Amino acid sequence: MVYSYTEKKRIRKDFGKRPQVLDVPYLLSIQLDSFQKFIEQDPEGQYGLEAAFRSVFPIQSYSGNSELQYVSYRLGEPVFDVQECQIRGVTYSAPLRVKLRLVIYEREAPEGTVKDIKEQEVYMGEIPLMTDNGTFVINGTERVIVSQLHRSPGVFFDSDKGKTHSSGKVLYNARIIPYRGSWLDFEFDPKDNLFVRIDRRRKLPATIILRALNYTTEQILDLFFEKVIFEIRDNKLQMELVPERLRGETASFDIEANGKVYVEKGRRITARHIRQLEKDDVKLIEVPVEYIAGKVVAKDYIDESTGELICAANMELSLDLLAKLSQSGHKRIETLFTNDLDHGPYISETLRVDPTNDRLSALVEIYRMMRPGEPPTREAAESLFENLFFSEDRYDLSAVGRMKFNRSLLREEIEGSGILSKDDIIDVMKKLIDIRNGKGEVDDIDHLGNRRIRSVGEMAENQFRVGLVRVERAVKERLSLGDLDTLMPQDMINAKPISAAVKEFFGSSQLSQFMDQNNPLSEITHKRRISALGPGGLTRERAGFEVRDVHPTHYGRVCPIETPEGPNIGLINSLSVYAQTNEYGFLETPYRKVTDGVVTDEIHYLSAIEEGNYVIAQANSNLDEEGHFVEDLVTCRSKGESSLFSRDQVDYMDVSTQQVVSVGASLIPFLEHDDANRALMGANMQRQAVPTLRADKPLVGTGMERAVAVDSGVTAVAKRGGVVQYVDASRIVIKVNEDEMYPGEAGIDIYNLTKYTRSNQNTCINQMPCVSLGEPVERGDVLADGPSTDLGELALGQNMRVAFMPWNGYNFEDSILVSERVVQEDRFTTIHIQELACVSRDTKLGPEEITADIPNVGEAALSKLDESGIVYIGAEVTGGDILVGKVTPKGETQLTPEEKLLRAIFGEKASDVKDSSLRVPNGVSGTVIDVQVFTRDGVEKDKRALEIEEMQLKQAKKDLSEELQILEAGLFSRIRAVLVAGGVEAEKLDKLPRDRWLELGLTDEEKQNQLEQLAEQYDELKHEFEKKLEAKRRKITQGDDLAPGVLKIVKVYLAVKRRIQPGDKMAGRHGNKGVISKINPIEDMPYDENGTPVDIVLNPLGVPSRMNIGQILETHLGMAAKGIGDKINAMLKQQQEVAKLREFIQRAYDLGADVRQKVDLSTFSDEEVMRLAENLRKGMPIATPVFDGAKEAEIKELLKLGDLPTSGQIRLYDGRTGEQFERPVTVGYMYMLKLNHLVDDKMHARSTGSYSLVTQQPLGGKAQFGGQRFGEMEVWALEAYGAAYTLQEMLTVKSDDVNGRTKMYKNIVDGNHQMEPGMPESFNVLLKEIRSLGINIELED
């Protein structure tokens, strides 16, 4: 209803029928929340730097009672702010201070009081901060850390059926993945023996790793198996029975009790007979003796009289042992209950496989597995087995690992230790045995309850912990000989490896990528990116096929259609619109809580696991006004499968129809009328659209570009609401409203807009004001249109008049014809900015000069240079001329030990001169817009550098004078207002300066004396501004440090202006590419009956093949938009009355079915209406939400509001013949882009250039002036013809025959076409490195 003061500039007509309930969140929340979580003063130390300092410290010597502990930390202020840091070259660092407290104890008392404590703020490293846009600054440039998608810390029960042993028998491995430590795996062989392995070493039986934690064999058989108790009746002994054990069996004898025969011999045991035993309640039956012929006795048995071991634990029984235990009276006999279907004897078989017997032997066997050849010693094996699992140093699950590991075992609590235990490993074995039995199932990997995301801060603290461990090892080695009482804790902390690790990760990792600054869309879709490559994850040539497809729990968490294509599909997924990172790191997505009948508005968030239990309604389900499913059966879904459910059965409902996709494809209008392949291609090709000279809004866009263009960083937003006070082309100064002023000296705001400067893709980032002087703005509203924005709307390309027809073949497969009206209005012209530096180097033979004295050149090439040796600001240069004149000394042979003394002082440091001036590269042109000069501390500055110094100094004076003038006037008003008290004379007041108003005498009140004290307080504030000016000039005046070897650096920017020409690539938003084939005049165009030509001719044949049918609906809706625009323009050129204009705008804004805008112009008070008409007069902008689009009939009615034909087809005439095109064609306005595959980055040629060093081949590439790779398959192609001599030239004369090619060149210039065959130098290279081995190889004859 009520609209913002820029929102009242134009209204986008919004179709779409669903009431939304949750707006779009801040699109860059993940980066900022991550790095804010990283650096923060954190009590309880669970995360951040405080965890990294609690994990390592305190550090102590080898019982030498010298110890280093930890007090606190602090981050120093940034020495350099952002923009000049991007100019100069450094990182945007921040210094670090650590308060360390070195202690040493008093001897012969370890708990005795330390005698020396020494506290310091040791410097260590530099940690880079984060820009306000979520990015980092590394080496002058701006880089983004991509989030990572890896496997969860926890436990997995995979099957991995099939390929093993070719028998069809499945397997069941169980893996434990720790967060920081060593692996643990459990496997099955087809002999059903249960094996263990650690860190992918060779195999061991799991019985020994079960024994090594102090278990006897009878305890193993007691845990992993149940019992059957035999009691020796003196003849034909009995057997206990719970009858459910007999289920699914074949009776070996006649099962019977109390004379009642239950099962006969040969009959399988039925559940009927089981229920008979249930009714009869039988506890004992009487087996024959031979029935224990094959069973296994559970525990060990000795002779109670003689001490003879009768039978051990896990022994296969015979009748002799039964007779001996009957003689020894061991009637009560345990026996392992076995089965083939439910309780399989799997452990006992493995326990009969292994060679290893007891605990110390088990530790010896593991200790021999881990390292071969080392001496098996008791304490070393004990320490190895402790350090593998049961210690904090080298086995750390996180909280997430304990979460998943208690969840996947049906535990109760979710808070445990970061180490393992006995119960954990035996529970993993129990669960794996249960999975082998049949109950329970595997855990598929692609399901997003198993794949976490890592943001930036977690990877940062891992690399910082690595660097801290290295420095800890070095400081422990130093302090182990700690014997000096003068040691202070700067002597021992070498700050080189910590800084090496931090600068290694942030500088050049695999996840530190450049940010593509050629759209605001490109930036904000590059930060929202979920990658699966890098360390901790897979590689792009070992991922198979299953991790790339769409698992059915990507809904609302990962965009299905935005991905790169080609080599790595499905690994670089883009994050959904409404997605939030969970508390632990999974991906939660919003849903709406629904009661029994009422769809409420209390939104919840759900994880990836909780969604597969509830029942979720699809979004576009028609409702009441109170909230009721108006049907009875609703399209819903339960567990991976959509279906149709009841009405009093649903639990959750979607939030909006946008949440399936990402921001890179919520900006395609009429997305739901497109094949998914072409939606993929369109969502990839939006983020390569180069920005244009004059930006321009799109007519047909989804209702999303305002949040994209604001929530990125390219525009400036007023932080507090107020009144516009000053607007230049460069900056905007805002007076703040008095309600938003915190009462201590708030004042004003200043925004310095960024002017023409460099982006990472050599495009021209720009800002411009969009508010007028004395205009009100409000908090949270836009002020500065950035690049490819327009009034706070993302606006990439421009929208043009397009006809779908075949025109003389100039649009054959995908080509585009463009009329010259698009060139003459220069509406795809693009500004590019290149950068070139030049350094003065300290070589031998003397240094290098930046002087203007260059021999062997004319006077005219020196004209653009000044006398200091540098071209002026704004001299339009071309390719080949001198930018910066640099000269080098060249002796060559002087060798005099006295002449070099006089040459280094008197002889100018210049005796003979070789030209090394930075010249313009070939082809490029432009206008020099900016020059920077950087001088080493020690060399005196050249006078042009002093001119830059003076210019920057005046710039530093101006703004401080501005703040002083605006600040002193309040106390001016106060001295006048208190001078009113007592007595004031205004004619006598304004005739003499302001200190004389201050020193105007009046009788002392307390108020005037306190305000006089405040007057000297602005006097000392003036002194503070003086010290501010001094602080600026000491920064500007002081020379620089540099690299070792370089004297001074001159940096030269250039700017060039690229028009359009046949060869460039333009493309719509629906995946319809094209190369501009011809560039026609105006009068060869198809004009309609009204006379206006058509800008662009497409090709219709591309529409039925690839099903991108949404572009024709975009074309029709765009023609309707401009059709409303032409009536608005006709009503404004006739300057009619604003009541009729108000009425027409109102009738155009109602128009349709139950839309949700409902604007009313009875509040716009006859000035917003005229400003709104002045904005709308070039077309009426129209919104269309993605899965809530505009139907066909509403486009028909909007075309009926204008005087356009309903069918969308107009008779078109012909430019050439003046005849009529017979059938009606389709004309409309389509919004088109320009991609940066420009033809003056591709057209490259070579006649005769440079050559490489090792082999005498020509180089490759455009920049290095190379030739093309006439590769292997082309040689197969020339062999496939009868071509023989041409293969000889492409192999020998064009390259690798030196004398052959120079003879050929001379022979061409002489005018004789011969050739000289020769022999390629690369073959002699091959001979000389086969002879470098022990291989004689020669040539016979």
């Binding site: 497809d549 299905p560 259609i561 080609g566 499905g570 699809q618 576009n620 399209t635 129809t657 399936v660 009328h673 094949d675 075949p806 073949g809 054959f812 497969e813 995908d814 080509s815 046949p1062 060869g1063 690539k1065 094209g1074 190369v1075 084939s1077 044949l1101 529409v1103 039925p1104 099903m1107 049918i1109 609906l1113 029709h1116 899965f1187 689009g1189 969308g1208 059938r1223 033809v1239 003056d1240 057209m1243 070579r1246 006649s1247 005769t1248 250039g1249 081949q1257 190379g1266 030739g1267 006439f1270 082309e1274 040689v1275 197969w1276 192609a1277 062999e1279 496939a1280 041409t1286 030239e1289 050929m1304 060149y1305 210039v1309 011969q1314 050739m1315 390629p1320």
Partner: protein, 586 residues
Amino acid sequence: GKRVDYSGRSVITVGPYLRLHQCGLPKKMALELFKPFIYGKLELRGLATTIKAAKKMVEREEAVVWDILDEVIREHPVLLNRAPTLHRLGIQAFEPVLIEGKAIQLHPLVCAAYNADFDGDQMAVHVPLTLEAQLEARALMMSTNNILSPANGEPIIVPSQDVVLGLYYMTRDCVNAKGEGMVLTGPKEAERLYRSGLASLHARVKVRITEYEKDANGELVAKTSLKDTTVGRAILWMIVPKGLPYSIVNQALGKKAISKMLNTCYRILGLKPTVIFADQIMYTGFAYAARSGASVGIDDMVIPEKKHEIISEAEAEVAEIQEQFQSGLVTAGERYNKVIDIWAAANDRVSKAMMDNLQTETVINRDGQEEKQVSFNSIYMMADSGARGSAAQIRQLAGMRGLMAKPDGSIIETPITANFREGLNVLQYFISTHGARKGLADTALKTANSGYLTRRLVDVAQDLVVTEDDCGTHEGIMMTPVIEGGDVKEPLRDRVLGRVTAEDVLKPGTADILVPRNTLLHEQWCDLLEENSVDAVKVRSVVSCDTDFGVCAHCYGRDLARGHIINKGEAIGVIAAQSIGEPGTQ
């Protein structure tokens, strides 16, 4: 693979005004390539003396240099290349035509042989520079010498999508238009009636046509008659050469029809009328495709009127099968099978209804009451001509779309009930994304596997050259036309066209020599072998050729991509490995 001087790279662009044997070359890049030829021509004509004078003159780009460059071009061909070269038509030689621009223009009929897009595809340029290389690139490799393909004897100069649409729109008929039923003198009077707007392009009319038939043994026979035909067909007849009969242009002329038009013109007349006839077809096809104005709009995709109750009846049937499963009579697997069968039947009925509603809806007044005819709808002309699309794509545009299969391998219960002209909701689009990403990943790995297999095959067969004429043996193989049990898949004519007979295959009239034992089965001879219904022919292979270190000529037969028997030297192992390994991407 050595990098090569005198090369260059650009982006390409169509340029439909070229002839078949030339290409568009940028002016500046052509000055850059031919610098030593320029230096030689300057020092010949006295306009310079040293090499440095010539370097200054060509860096100033004076106006004499462009005339010198045009003397350098005139008869000096240029090789062009596209980067992932599969088969031996990948690099070809053209002549240059200078263009003030920055892109390379390229004749559109060749573009199918390169398998080139104009989606941003880049190409490269090399220069033949000696004398033998110029002469080989003119003889062995000029693009007027590559019509038939080496993999199979079919022309690779098929007119593509837009020329197909133009020629299909010209040669049709409709039962009431301007000037119907009048009478004409020549084809040129039909052209003069089309230009004036008196008679429309397709209105039926009796004309007089002279045609030449070369059944006389080496000369031409005139014949003049009056035929019932169309104004557009009479206009198209003006570019047909002397040889062909008029019944080649009397039909509706889709894609395969004009392809066999070119093929019969190659068989009867020779080479040069085939090249010049492909050029005239391309020119007039683009001209009348321009004058058509064949657009596409949202009211050219007719929804059936009966779609709604078909979907309602399918829902009633699946509810009945769900209740029969719920009572417990039918198991789950047969429930699955009944549901998938009835949705297959419903999809087939909807597709039949929409195709019957599109193809013949156009009713027009006869000057009597009413008739029926083939439609002039937009996408129906784009499918019926075979330019772009099948019944499947135009089926998904208006009728409902198929049954999407989940990536597990199963096929989902509920098919996508909607088309593309109506909107898809959230779930159905999310389902279609599966098939999208599956096809993309399949392409991404299929490329590399086909490349590796082509690499290994051309490693194997490289050292094998047709090295002598006649090994002179009497072995071979016996060919019978293959029959699975359904239809006969390949007849005897297609397999054993053009291979040298092993033994004298006798006539079914026994002891009558129907074929001599050592001749070549050319086409007329193949028909005269076909007439007596021969089932098995014995024929000489390569696997039993006798020649040490090579393959004899008569053991390999006639060559593809040219006409006659193969010459001594054609490196047949490499072209064979390329012909197997080229369509491996498909």
